[PDB]
Coordinates of C-alpha atoms and ligand atoms in Angstrom, one line a residue:
Chain B
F6 CA 0.0 0.0 0.0
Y7 CA 2.8 2.4 1.0
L8 CA 4.8 1.6 -2.2
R9 CA 1.7 2.0 -4.4
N10 CA 1.2 5.4 -2.8
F11 CA 4.9 6.4 -3.2
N12 CA 4.8 5.4 -6.9
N13 CA 1.6 7.5 -7.4
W14 CA 3.5 10.5 -6.0
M15 CA 6.3 9.8 -8.5
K16 CA 3.8 9.5 -11.3
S17 CA 1.9 12.6 -10.2
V18 CA 5.0 14.8 -10.3
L19 CA 6.2 13.4 -13.6
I20 CA 2.8 13.7 -15.3
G21 CA 2.3 17.1 -13.7
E22 CA 5.6 18.4 -15.0
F23 CA 4.8 17.6 -18.6
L24 CA 1.1 18.4 -18.4
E25 CA 2.1 21.9 -17.3
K26 CA 4.6 22.1 -20.2
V27 CA 1.9 21.1 -22.7
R28 CA -0.6 23.6 -21.2
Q29 CA 2.0 26.5 -21.7
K30 CA 2.3 25.3 -25.3
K31 CA -1.1 24.2 -26.5
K32 CA -4.3 26.2 -26.2
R33 CA -6.9 23.5 -26.8
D34 CA -7.5 19.8 -27.6
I35 CA -5.0 18.3 -25.1
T36 CA -4.9 14.6 -26.0
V37 CA -3.1 11.8 -24.1
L38 CA -2.3 8.1 -24.8
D39 CA -1.9 5.9 -21.7
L40 CA 0.0 2.9 -23.0
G41 CA -0.4 0.0 -20.6
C42 CA -3.0 1.7 -18.4
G43 CA -3.7 -1.4 -16.2
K44 CA -6.8 -1.0 -14.0
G45 CA -6.5 2.8 -14.5
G46 CA -4.5 4.2 -11.5
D47 CA -3.8 7.4 -13.5
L48 CA -7.3 8.4 -14.5
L49 CA -7.5 10.7 -11.6
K50 CA -4.2 12.3 -12.6
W51 CA -5.5 13.1 -16.1
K52 CA -8.8 14.5 -14.8
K53 CA -6.8 16.8 -12.5
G54 CA -4.7 17.9 -15.5
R55 CA -7.9 19.1 -17.2
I56 CA -7.0 17.3 -20.5
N57 CA -9.5 16.9 -23.3
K58 CA -9.2 13.4 -24.7
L59 CA -7.7 10.1 -23.2
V60 CA -6.9 6.9 -25.0
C61 CA -6.4 4.0 -22.6
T62 CA -4.9 0.7 -23.8
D63 CA -3.5 -2.5 -22.2
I64 CA -2.9 -6.1 -23.3
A65 CA -5.1 -7.5 -20.4
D66 CA -8.7 -7.1 -21.6
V67 CA -9.8 -7.5 -18.0
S68 CA -7.7 -4.5 -17.0
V69 CA -9.2 -2.5 -19.9
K70 CA -12.8 -3.1 -18.7
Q71 CA -12.0 -2.3 -15.1
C72 CA -10.3 0.8 -16.3
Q73 CA -13.3 1.7 -18.5
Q74 CA -15.6 1.0 -15.6
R75 CA -13.6 3.3 -13.2
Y76 CA -13.8 6.0 -15.9
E77 CA -17.6 5.6 -16.3
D78 CA -18.0 5.8 -12.5
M79 CA -16.0 9.0 -12.2
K80 CA -17.8 10.5 -15.2
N81 CA -21.1 10.0 -13.4
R82 CA -20.1 11.6 -10.0
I88 CA -14.3 15.5 -17.8
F89 CA -12.2 14.3 -20.8
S90 CA -13.6 12.0 -23.4
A91 CA -11.9 8.6 -23.1
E92 CA -11.3 5.6 -25.4
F93 CA -10.5 2.0 -24.3
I94 CA -8.7 -0.4 -26.5
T95 CA -7.4 -3.9 -25.7
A96 CA -4.3 -4.7 -27.6
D97 CA -0.7 -5.8 -27.5
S98 CA 1.1 -2.5 -28.2
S99 CA 4.3 -4.5 -29.0
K100 CA 2.7 -6.5 -31.8
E101 CA -0.3 -4.4 -33.0
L102 CA -0.5 -1.0 -34.5
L103 CA -2.8 1.1 -32.2
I104 CA -3.5 3.3 -35.2
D105 CA -5.6 0.3 -36.4
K106 CA -7.9 0.7 -33.4
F107 CA -8.4 4.4 -32.7
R108 CA -11.8 5.6 -33.6
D109 CA -9.9 8.2 -35.6
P110 CA -6.8 6.7 -37.2
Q111 CA -5.1 10.1 -37.8
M112 CA -5.5 11.4 -34.2
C113 CA -2.3 12.8 -32.7
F114 CA -1.1 12.9 -29.1
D115 CA 0.4 15.5 -26.9
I116 CA 1.7 13.0 -24.3
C117 CA 2.2 9.3 -24.4
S118 CA 2.5 8.1 -20.8
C119 CA 3.8 4.6 -20.3
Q120 CA 4.2 3.7 -16.6
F121 CA 6.0 0.4 -15.7
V122 CA 5.2 -1.0 -19.2
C123 CA 8.1 -0.5 -21.6
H124 CA 10.4 -3.3 -20.5
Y125 CA 7.8 -6.0 -21.4
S126 CA 8.5 -5.0 -25.1
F127 CA 12.3 -5.7 -25.0
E128 CA 11.4 -9.4 -25.5
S129 CA 12.6 -8.7 -29.1
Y130 CA 13.7 -6.0 -31.4
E131 CA 10.5 -5.9 -33.4
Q132 CA 8.3 -5.6 -30.3
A133 CA 10.4 -2.8 -28.7
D134 CA 10.4 -0.9 -32.0
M135 CA 6.6 -1.5 -32.3
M136 CA 5.8 -0.1 -28.8
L137 CA 8.0 2.9 -29.5
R138 CA 6.2 3.5 -32.8
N139 CA 2.9 3.3 -30.9
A140 CA 4.1 5.7 -28.2
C141 CA 5.9 8.3 -30.5
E142 CA 4.6 8.1 -34.1
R143 CA 1.4 10.0 -33.4
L144 CA 3.0 12.5 -31.0
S145 CA 2.5 16.1 -32.2
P146 CA 5.7 18.2 -32.6
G147 CA 6.8 19.2 -29.2
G148 CA 4.9 16.2 -27.7
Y149 CA 6.2 14.1 -24.9
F150 CA 6.9 10.4 -24.3
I151 CA 7.2 9.9 -20.6
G152 CA 7.5 6.8 -18.4
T153 CA 9.0 4.6 -15.7
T154 CA 11.0 1.4 -16.1
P155 CA 13.5 -0.7 -14.1
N156 CA 17.1 0.7 -14.3
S157 CA 19.1 -2.1 -16.0
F158 CA 22.3 -1.0 -14.4
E159 CA 20.9 -1.3 -10.9
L160 CA 19.5 -4.8 -11.7
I161 CA 22.9 -6.0 -13.1
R162 CA 24.8 -4.4 -10.2
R163 CA 22.7 -6.3 -7.6
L164 CA 22.8 -9.5 -9.6
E165 CA 26.6 -9.5 -9.8
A166 CA 27.1 -8.6 -6.1
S167 CA 24.7 -11.5 -5.1
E168 CA 25.8 -15.2 -4.8
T169 CA 22.7 -16.7 -6.5
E170 CA 21.0 -15.5 -9.7
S171 CA 18.7 -13.9 -7.1
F172 CA 18.4 -10.9 -4.8
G173 CA 15.6 -9.3 -2.9
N174 CA 13.8 -9.2 0.5
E175 CA 10.3 -9.8 2.0
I176 CA 8.7 -7.4 -0.6
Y177 CA 10.3 -8.3 -3.9
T178 CA 12.5 -11.0 -5.4
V179 CA 14.4 -10.7 -8.6
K180 CA 15.6 -14.0 -10.2
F181 CA 17.7 -13.8 -13.4
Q182 CA 17.7 -16.7 -15.9
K183 CA 21.6 -16.6 -15.8
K184 CA 24.5 -14.3 -15.1
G185 CA 27.0 -12.5 -17.2
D186 CA 24.7 -12.7 -20.3
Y187 CA 22.6 -9.6 -20.8
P188 CA 21.4 -9.5 -24.4
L189 CA 20.0 -6.3 -25.9
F190 CA 16.7 -8.2 -26.4
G191 CA 15.1 -11.1 -24.6
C192 CA 17.2 -10.9 -21.5
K193 CA 14.6 -12.4 -19.2
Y194 CA 14.2 -12.1 -15.5
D195 CA 11.5 -12.7 -12.8
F196 CA 10.1 -9.9 -10.8
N197 CA 8.3 -11.4 -7.8
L198 CA 6.1 -8.8 -6.1
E199 CA 5.4 -10.9 -3.0
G200 CA 2.6 -11.6 -3.2
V201 CA 0.7 -9.6 -5.7
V202 CA 2.2 -10.6 -9.1
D203 CA 5.2 -12.5 -10.4
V204 CA 5.7 -11.5 -14.1
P205 CA 8.4 -12.2 -16.7
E206 CA 10.2 -8.9 -17.4
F207 CA 12.9 -7.9 -19.9
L208 CA 16.1 -5.8 -19.4
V209 CA 16.1 -2.4 -21.0
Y210 CA 19.5 -0.9 -21.5
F211 CA 18.5 2.7 -21.4
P212 CA 21.0 3.9 -24.0
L213 CA 19.4 1.4 -26.4
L214 CA 16.0 2.9 -25.8
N215 CA 17.3 6.4 -26.3
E216 CA 18.9 5.6 -29.6
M217 CA 15.8 3.6 -30.7
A218 CA 13.5 6.6 -30.0
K219 CA 15.5 8.6 -32.5
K220 CA 13.8 6.6 -35.2
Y221 CA 10.7 8.5 -34.2
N222 CA 12.4 11.9 -34.1
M223 CA 12.5 12.1 -30.3
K224 CA 15.2 13.5 -28.0
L225 CA 16.0 12.9 -24.4
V226 CA 14.6 15.5 -22.0
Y227 CA 16.0 13.7 -19.0
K228 CA 16.8 10.3 -17.5
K229 CA 16.7 10.1 -13.7
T230 CA 17.0 7.3 -11.2
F231 CA 14.1 7.2 -8.7
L232 CA 16.5 8.6 -6.2
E233 CA 17.5 11.6 -8.4
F234 CA 13.9 12.2 -9.3
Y235 CA 12.8 12.2 -5.7
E236 CA 15.7 14.5 -4.5
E237 CA 15.1 17.1 -7.2
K238 CA 11.3 17.0 -7.2
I239 CA 11.1 17.2 -3.4
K240 CA 12.6 20.7 -3.4
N241 CA 9.4 22.0 -5.0
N242 CA 6.7 23.2 -2.7
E243 CA 3.5 21.9 -4.2
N244 CA 5.3 18.5 -4.6
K245 CA 6.1 18.5 -0.9
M246 CA 2.5 19.6 0.0
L247 CA 1.2 16.7 -2.1
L248 CA 3.5 14.3 -0.3
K249 CA 2.2 15.2 3.2
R250 CA -1.4 15.4 1.9
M251 CA -0.9 11.8 0.6
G252 CA 0.3 10.4 3.9
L253 CA 3.9 9.9 2.8
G254 CA 7.1 10.4 4.8
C255 CA 10.0 8.0 4.8
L256 CA 10.1 4.6 2.9
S257 CA 11.3 1.7 5.0
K258 CA 14.6 0.2 3.9
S259 CA 13.0 -2.8 2.3
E260 CA 10.6 -0.5 0.3
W261 CA 13.4 1.8 -0.6
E262 CA 15.4 -1.2 -2.0
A263 CA 12.4 -2.3 -4.0
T264 CA 11.6 1.1 -5.5
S265 CA 15.2 2.3 -6.1
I266 CA 15.3 -0.3 -8.9
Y267 CA 13.4 2.1 -11.1
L268 CA 14.2 5.2 -13.2
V269 CA 12.0 7.8 -14.9
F270 CA 12.5 9.0 -18.5
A271 CA 11.1 11.9 -20.6
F272 CA 11.6 12.2 -24.4
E273 CA 10.3 14.9 -26.7
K274 CA 9.2 14.9 -30.3
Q275 CA 11.4 17.2 -32.4
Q276 CA 10.4 19.3 -35.5
Chain A
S3 CA 58.3 1.1 -14.1
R4 CA 56.0 -1.7 -13.0
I5 CA 54.5 -1.3 -16.5
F6 CA 57.0 -4.2 -17.1
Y7 CA 54.9 -6.4 -14.8
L8 CA 51.5 -5.4 -16.2
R9 CA 52.8 -6.0 -19.8
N10 CA 53.9 -9.5 -18.8
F11 CA 50.6 -10.2 -17.1
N12 CA 48.7 -9.0 -20.1
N13 CA 50.9 -11.2 -22.3
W14 CA 49.9 -14.2 -20.2
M15 CA 46.2 -13.4 -20.7
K16 CA 46.7 -13.0 -24.5
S17 CA 48.8 -16.2 -24.7
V18 CA 46.1 -18.2 -22.9
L19 CA 43.4 -16.7 -25.1
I20 CA 45.3 -17.1 -28.4
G21 CA 46.4 -20.6 -27.4
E22 CA 42.9 -21.8 -26.7
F23 CA 41.6 -20.9 -30.1
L24 CA 44.7 -21.8 -32.0
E25 CA 44.4 -25.3 -30.7
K26 CA 40.7 -25.3 -31.6
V27 CA 41.6 -24.2 -35.2
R28 CA 44.5 -26.7 -35.4
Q29 CA 42.1 -29.6 -35.0
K30 CA 39.0 -28.6 -37.0
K31 CA 41.3 -28.6 -40.0
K32 CA 44.7 -30.1 -41.0
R33 CA 45.9 -27.2 -43.0
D34 CA 47.7 -23.9 -43.1
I35 CA 46.6 -21.5 -40.4
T36 CA 46.1 -17.9 -41.4
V37 CA 45.6 -15.0 -39.0
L38 CA 44.6 -11.3 -38.9
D39 CA 46.2 -9.3 -36.2
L40 CA 44.0 -6.2 -36.2
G41 CA 45.6 -3.2 -34.4
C42 CA 48.8 -5.1 -34.1
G43 CA 50.8 -2.1 -32.8
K44 CA 54.5 -2.7 -32.5
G45 CA 54.1 -6.5 -32.9
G46 CA 53.9 -7.6 -29.2
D47 CA 52.1 -10.8 -30.2
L48 CA 54.4 -11.8 -33.1
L49 CA 56.1 -14.2 -30.7
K50 CA 52.7 -15.7 -29.7
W51 CA 52.1 -16.5 -33.3
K52 CA 55.5 -18.0 -33.8
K53 CA 55.0 -20.4 -30.9
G54 CA 51.5 -21.2 -32.4
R55 CA 53.3 -22.4 -35.5
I56 CA 50.9 -20.6 -37.9
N57 CA 51.5 -20.4 -41.6
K58 CA 50.4 -16.9 -42.8
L59 CA 50.0 -13.7 -40.8
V60 CA 48.5 -10.3 -41.7
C61 CA 49.5 -7.4 -39.4
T62 CA 47.5 -4.2 -39.7
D63 CA 47.4 -1.0 -37.6
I64 CA 46.3 2.6 -38.2
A65 CA 49.8 3.8 -37.2
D66 CA 52.3 3.5 -40.0
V67 CA 55.2 4.0 -37.6
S68 CA 54.0 1.1 -35.5
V69 CA 53.5 -1.1 -38.6
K70 CA 57.1 -0.5 -39.6
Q71 CA 58.2 -1.3 -36.1
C72 CA 56.2 -4.5 -36.2
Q73 CA 57.7 -5.4 -39.6
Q74 CA 61.2 -4.6 -38.2
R75 CA 60.5 -7.0 -35.3
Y76 CA 59.3 -9.7 -37.6
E77 CA 62.4 -9.5 -39.8
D78 CA 64.6 -9.7 -36.7
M79 CA 62.7 -12.9 -35.7
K80 CA 63.5 -14.5 -39.0
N81 CA 67.2 -13.8 -38.5
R82 CA 67.2 -16.3 -35.7
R83 CA 68.2 -19.9 -36.1
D84 CA 64.9 -21.3 -34.8
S85 CA 62.7 -19.6 -37.4
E86 CA 62.8 -22.2 -40.2
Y87 CA 59.0 -22.8 -40.0
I88 CA 58.1 -19.1 -39.2
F89 CA 54.8 -17.9 -40.8
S90 CA 54.9 -15.5 -43.7
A91 CA 53.7 -12.0 -42.8
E92 CA 52.3 -8.9 -44.6
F93 CA 52.1 -5.4 -43.1
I94 CA 49.4 -2.9 -44.0
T95 CA 48.8 0.6 -42.7
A96 CA 45.1 1.3 -42.6
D97 CA 42.2 2.7 -40.5
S98 CA 40.2 -0.5 -40.0
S99 CA 37.2 1.6 -39.0
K100 CA 37.3 3.4 -42.3
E101 CA 39.1 1.4 -44.9
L102 CA 38.2 -2.1 -46.3
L103 CA 41.2 -4.3 -45.6
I104 CA 40.0 -6.6 -48.5
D105 CA 41.3 -4.1 -51.1
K106 CA 44.8 -4.1 -49.5
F107 CA 45.7 -7.8 -49.1
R108 CA 48.2 -9.2 -51.6
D109 CA 45.5 -11.8 -52.1
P110 CA 42.1 -10.0 -52.1
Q111 CA 40.3 -13.4 -51.7
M112 CA 42.3 -14.7 -48.7
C113 CA 40.4 -16.0 -45.7
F114 CA 41.3 -16.1 -42.0
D115 CA 41.0 -18.8 -39.3
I116 CA 41.6 -16.3 -36.6
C117 CA 41.2 -12.5 -36.4
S118 CA 43.0 -11.4 -33.2
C119 CA 42.0 -7.9 -32.0
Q120 CA 43.7 -7.1 -28.6
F121 CA 43.0 -3.8 -27.0
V122 CA 41.8 -2.2 -30.2
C123 CA 38.1 -2.6 -30.9
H124 CA 37.0 0.1 -28.4
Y125 CA 38.6 2.8 -30.5
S126 CA 36.1 2.0 -33.3
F127 CA 33.0 2.8 -31.2
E128 CA 33.5 6.5 -32.0
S129 CA 30.5 6.0 -34.3
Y130 CA 28.3 3.2 -35.5
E131 CA 29.8 3.1 -39.0
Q132 CA 33.3 2.7 -37.5
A133 CA 32.3 -0.1 -35.1
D134 CA 30.4 -1.8 -38.0
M135 CA 33.4 -1.4 -40.3
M136 CA 36.0 -2.7 -37.7
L137 CA 33.7 -5.7 -37.3
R138 CA 33.5 -6.3 -41.0
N139 CA 37.2 -6.3 -41.3
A140 CA 37.5 -8.6 -38.3
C141 CA 34.8 -11.2 -39.3
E142 CA 33.7 -10.9 -42.9
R143 CA 36.8 -12.7 -44.2
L144 CA 36.7 -15.4 -41.5
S145 CA 36.3 -18.9 -42.7
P146 CA 33.3 -20.8 -41.3
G147 CA 34.3 -22.1 -38.0
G148 CA 36.8 -19.3 -37.7
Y149 CA 37.3 -17.2 -34.6
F150 CA 37.2 -13.5 -33.6
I151 CA 38.9 -13.0 -30.2
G152 CA 40.0 -10.0 -28.3
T153 CA 40.3 -7.8 -25.2
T154 CA 38.6 -4.5 -24.5
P155 CA 37.4 -2.4 -21.5
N156 CA 34.4 -3.8 -19.5
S157 CA 32.0 -0.9 -19.7
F158 CA 30.1 -2.1 -16.7
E159 CA 33.2 -1.7 -14.6
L160 CA 34.1 1.7 -16.0
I161 CA 30.7 3.1 -15.2
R162 CA 30.6 1.5 -11.8
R163 CA 33.9 3.1 -11.0
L164 CA 32.6 6.4 -12.5
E165 CA 29.2 6.5 -10.7
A166 CA 30.9 5.5 -7.5
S167 CA 33.5 8.2 -8.1
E168 CA 33.4 11.6 -6.4
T169 CA 34.3 13.5 -9.7
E170 CA 34.2 12.6 -13.4
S171 CA 37.6 10.9 -12.8
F172 CA 38.9 7.7 -11.2
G173 CA 42.3 6.0 -11.1
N174 CA 45.5 5.6 -9.2
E175 CA 49.2 6.2 -9.7
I176 CA 49.2 3.8 -12.7
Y177 CA 46.1 5.0 -14.6
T178 CA 43.5 7.7 -14.7
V179 CA 40.1 7.6 -16.4
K180 CA 38.2 10.9 -17.1
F181 CA 34.7 10.9 -18.6
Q182 CA 33.0 14.0 -20.0
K183 CA 29.6 13.7 -18.2
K184 CA 28.2 11.2 -15.8
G185 CA 24.9 9.5 -16.7
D186 CA 25.1 10.0 -20.5
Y187 CA 26.4 6.7 -22.0
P188 CA 25.5 6.7 -25.7
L189 CA 25.8 3.5 -27.7
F190 CA 28.4 5.3 -29.9
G191 CA 30.5 8.4 -29.2
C192 CA 30.7 8.0 -25.4
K193 CA 34.2 9.5 -25.1
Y194 CA 36.5 9.3 -22.1
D195 CA 40.2 9.8 -21.7
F196 CA 42.5 7.0 -20.6
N197 CA 46.0 7.9 -19.3
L198 CA 48.4 5.1 -18.6
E199 CA 51.1 6.9 -16.5
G200 CA 54.1 7.4 -18.8
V201 CA 52.8 5.0 -21.4
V202 CA 49.9 6.5 -23.4
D203 CA 47.3 9.2 -23.1
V204 CA 44.6 8.4 -25.7
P205 CA 40.9 9.0 -26.0
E206 CA 38.7 5.8 -25.9
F207 CA 35.0 5.0 -26.3
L208 CA 32.7 2.9 -24.3
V209 CA 31.8 -0.5 -25.7
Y210 CA 28.5 -1.9 -24.4
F211 CA 29.5 -5.5 -24.9
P212 CA 25.9 -6.7 -25.4
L213 CA 25.8 -4.1 -28.3
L214 CA 29.1 -5.5 -29.7
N215 CA 27.6 -9.0 -29.4
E216 CA 24.5 -8.1 -31.4
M217 CA 26.4 -6.2 -34.1
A218 CA 28.7 -9.1 -34.7
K219 CA 25.8 -11.3 -35.6
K220 CA 25.5 -9.3 -38.8
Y221 CA 28.8 -11.0 -39.9
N222 CA 27.4 -14.4 -38.9
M223 CA 29.2 -14.6 -35.6
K224 CA 28.0 -16.2 -32.4
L225 CA 29.4 -15.6 -28.9
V226 CA 31.6 -18.4 -27.6
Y227 CA 32.2 -16.7 -24.3
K228 CA 32.8 -13.3 -22.6
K229 CA 34.7 -13.2 -19.3
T230 CA 36.0 -10.3 -17.2
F231 CA 39.7 -10.3 -16.7
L232 CA 39.2 -11.7 -13.2
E233 CA 36.7 -14.4 -14.3
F234 CA 39.1 -15.4 -17.2
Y235 CA 42.0 -15.6 -14.8
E236 CA 40.4 -17.8 -12.2
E237 CA 39.1 -20.3 -14.7
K238 CA 42.4 -20.5 -16.6
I239 CA 44.7 -20.7 -13.6
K240 CA 43.2 -24.2 -12.8
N241 CA 44.8 -25.7 -15.9
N242 CA 48.4 -26.5 -15.0
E243 CA 50.0 -25.5 -18.3
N244 CA 48.5 -22.0 -17.9
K245 CA 49.9 -21.7 -14.4
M246 CA 53.3 -23.3 -15.1
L247 CA 53.5 -20.7 -17.9
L248 CA 52.4 -17.9 -15.6
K249 CA 55.3 -18.6 -13.3
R250 CA 57.9 -19.0 -16.1
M251 CA 57.1 -15.4 -17.1
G254 CA 55.1 -12.9 -9.1
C255 CA 51.6 -12.0 -8.1
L256 CA 49.9 -8.6 -8.9
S257 CA 50.0 -5.4 -6.9
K258 CA 46.8 -3.7 -5.7
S259 CA 47.1 -0.7 -8.0
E260 CA 48.2 -3.0 -10.8
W261 CA 45.1 -5.3 -10.5
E262 CA 42.8 -2.2 -10.3
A263 CA 44.3 -1.3 -13.7
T264 CA 44.0 -4.7 -15.4
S265 CA 40.6 -5.6 -13.9
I266 CA 38.7 -3.0 -16.1
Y267 CA 39.2 -5.3 -19.1
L268 CA 37.2 -8.3 -20.5
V269 CA 38.1 -11.0 -23.0
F270 CA 35.8 -12.2 -25.7
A271 CA 35.6 -14.9 -28.3
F272 CA 33.2 -15.2 -31.3
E273 CA 32.9 -18.1 -33.8
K274 CA 31.9 -17.8 -37.5
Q275 CA 28.8 -19.9 -38.2
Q276 CA 28.7 -22.5 -41.1
Ligands
LIG1 N1 2.6 -5.7 -24.6 C1 1.9 -4.9 -23.9 N2 1.0 -4.0 -24.4 C2 0.2 -3.2 -23.6 N3 0.2 -3.4 -22.3 C3 1.1 -4.3 -21.7 C4 1.9 -5.1 -22.5 N4 2.6 -5.9 -21.7 C5 2.2 -5.7 -20.4 N5 1.3 -4.7 -20.4 C6 0.6 -4.0 -19.3 O1 1.4 -3.2 -18.5 C7 0.9 -3.1 -17.2 C8 2.0 -3.1 -16.1 S1 1.4 -2.6 -14.4 C9 1.4 -0.8 -14.8 C10 -0.1 -0.3 -14.7 C11 -0.4 1.3 -14.6 N6 0.2 1.9 -15.8 C12 0.2 1.9 -13.3 O2 1.2 2.6 -13.4 O3 -0.4 1.7 -12.3 C13 -0.1 -4.3 -17.1 O4 -1.4 -3.8 -17.1 C14 0.1 -5.1 -18.3 O5 -1.0 -5.7 -18.9
LIG2 N1 41.0 2.6 -36.1 C1 42.0 1.8 -35.9 N2 42.4 0.9 -36.9 C2 43.5 0.1 -36.7 N3 44.2 0.1 -35.6 C3 43.9 1.0 -34.6 C4 42.8 1.8 -34.8 N4 42.7 2.6 -33.6 C5 43.7 2.3 -32.8 N5 44.4 1.3 -33.4 C6 45.6 0.6 -32.8 O1 45.3 -0.2 -31.7 C7 46.5 -0.3 -30.9 C8 46.0 -0.4 -29.4 S1 47.4 -0.8 -28.4 C9 47.3 -2.6 -28.7 C10 48.5 -3.2 -29.4 C11 48.5 -4.7 -29.7 N6 47.2 -5.2 -30.2 C12 48.9 -5.5 -28.5 O2 48.0 -6.1 -27.8 O3 50.0 -5.5 -28.1 C13 47.4 0.9 -31.2 O4 48.6 0.5 -31.7 C14 46.6 1.7 -32.3 O5 47.3 2.2 -33.4
LIG3 O1 3.1 -0.3 -10.1 C1 4.3 -0.6 -10.1 C2 5.3 0.2 -9.4 C3 6.0 -0.6 -8.2 C4 5.2 -1.1 -7.2 C5 5.8 -1.8 -6.2 C6 7.2 -2.0 -6.2 F1 7.8 -2.7 -5.2 C7 8.0 -1.5 -7.2 C8 7.4 -0.8 -8.2 N1 4.6 -1.8 -10.9 C9 6.0 -2.4 -11.1 C10 6.0 -3.8 -10.4 C11 4.9 -4.7 -10.8 C12 3.6 -3.9 -10.8 C13 2.4 -4.8 -11.2 N2 1.3 -5.1 -10.5 N3 0.5 -5.9 -11.2 C14 1.0 -6.2 -12.4 N4 0.6 -6.9 -13.5 C15 1.3 -7.0 -14.6 O2 0.9 -7.8 -15.6 C16 2.6 -6.4 -14.7 C17 3.1 -5.6 -13.6 C18 2.3 -5.5 -12.5 C19 3.6 -2.6 -11.6
LIG4 O1 48.3 -3.6 -23.6 C1 47.4 -3.0 -23.1 C2 46.7 -3.7 -21.9 C3 47.0 -3.0 -20.5 C4 48.2 -2.4 -20.2 C5 48.4 -1.8 -19.0 C6 47.3 -1.9 -18.0 F1 47.5 -1.3 -16.8 C7 46.1 -2.5 -18.3 C8 46.0 -3.1 -19.6 N1 46.9 -1.8 -23.6 C9 45.8 -1.0 -23.0 C10 46.3 0.3 -22.4 C11 46.9 1.1 -23.5 C12 48.0 0.3 -24.2 C13 48.7 1.2 -25.3 N2 50.0 1.4 -25.4 N3 50.3 2.2 -26.4 C14 49.2 2.6 -27.1 N4 49.0 3.4 -28.2 C15 47.7 3.7 -28.6 O2 47.6 4.5 -29.7 C16 46.6 3.1 -28.0 C17 46.8 2.3 -26.9 C18 48.1 2.0 -26.4 C19 47.5 -1.0 -24.7

């Protein structure tokens, strides 16, 4: 519960930074693509951003319905929203938008990207889906496990495994970290245990250039927290959310991750 | 200096590597063994090839002054009484990240059983087209079943020492590494300076070895193994020949091991 809340604060400040930048740029028709939305934990964040149109997509059809339902519920207590079930690493989302020439101001992709580094075609496909329809000046923002921190911990271990009572990471073998299909197990004890894939961030950065994007920043969770905490509204939100200090086991689990922000060039 | 001791330790590491794949080549075929020493320098492995009893060697390096020194060292070797069987050699000055070596061989159709690239291939990661071209020169003319072997800095260990560093610099009295910015490690062009006290002050580029691995597939190569300098040493010491050899050439100082431990060895095999 406490980790889920900490990560929402991270996502809130990240989305909020770039929602603000879009609002200084655009005058109307703010449109967002939430690639890998899950059950919809960011719907509230997009409503607070006063955006105009949301596309929500995930590979789990059950998650897409729950996300749709949560939207309908909050509509009836707002942006227009679309809900598409699809593998964004194998399908073109352009094939499924109500309007196949719509463009986006932000693609947000939270804890989703690394599942596409199963293979070259899949990672390229998810990037296309996240950046191809970005308007000039648009943003591709997200969160994903920091490959360096995962390799560092795996080396320093004895087993192909490290973790604690919250999380366990088991690698399929050691010393072999292919650009694609480097598989490992992320055991969220006991929510989910999902196959994940390593993302060498310099690879992702170079790949995004195919879609005319440039790095805005790449920040470990630590860096992101330390910089974003100095802001006042960010600190206000942290207290208003019930958040103080992470426990050591929770810090270890969440320091695995980094945040990234790219921007569509002209 | 104690550069003398590092050189002799590095020569052991290269002997053990060269030897493993020479013996693999010697068995897969009966015949003449032909070798590409890419970035040969002054010819510090010429003796390793003479003990390997190979039949044809090609030495190439971007530095013409070093190529001539390597040729000069080869001709002195053949003035000895124990060089009846010594390989024949040709010496070419060329930028192997820019020029096609195929158009400079005496025989433009010749083929290699081994391309040996020791402490060279990281200079080519200046750009993609240079890393690609050095790999073409190293692997395209390899016979099927041939080998691409070498040594190069372990980028994971450079970045670990950098991140952990207090400034953009780390080293000791033997070496110093200075990057240009922390956090920004591009696939190509990641420049850092490498100063080996008294020996050499050169710019180098980071090689993400997984990227090197993938790019080598384009020339139909497959990884045989990659081992850090430590990992390689501990496995190879177990064999008595390797160890007897290590002692015929003491143990390593602290600041010396810190300097050699940045490196990894690799071996690729050309597929059929
Ligand atoms: N190939 C793929 N295409 C689209 N979504 C995928 C996917 N692979 C995994 N996912 C989705 O990515 C999600 C990861 S959990 C992240 C959920 C949400 N964005 C949040 O931050 O709370 C899961 O819902 C999973 O179904
Ligand atoms: N682009 C390039 N093409 C060919 N050789 C290069 C090169 N860039 C650097 N080199 C050579 O690589 C050498 C690295 S020093 C290594 C020397 C030798 N291989 C040995 O192990 O003893 C230098 O002599 C340098 O001239
Ligand atoms: O929300 C986060 C952030 C986070 C939370 C706690 C941590 F300890 C570290 C990170 N996630 C990263 C880890 C797995 C999370 C998750 N829950 N359910 C899933 N189903 C899937 O199919 C794929 C992923 C998940 C998604
Ligand atoms: O032999 C090794 C291995 C090694 C030696 C000592 C160590 F402490 C650890 C490793 N080298 C790596 C370091 C630079 C060496 C070198 N000497 N002269 C050069 N000229 C150039 O143009 C480029 C590189 C060099 C080559």
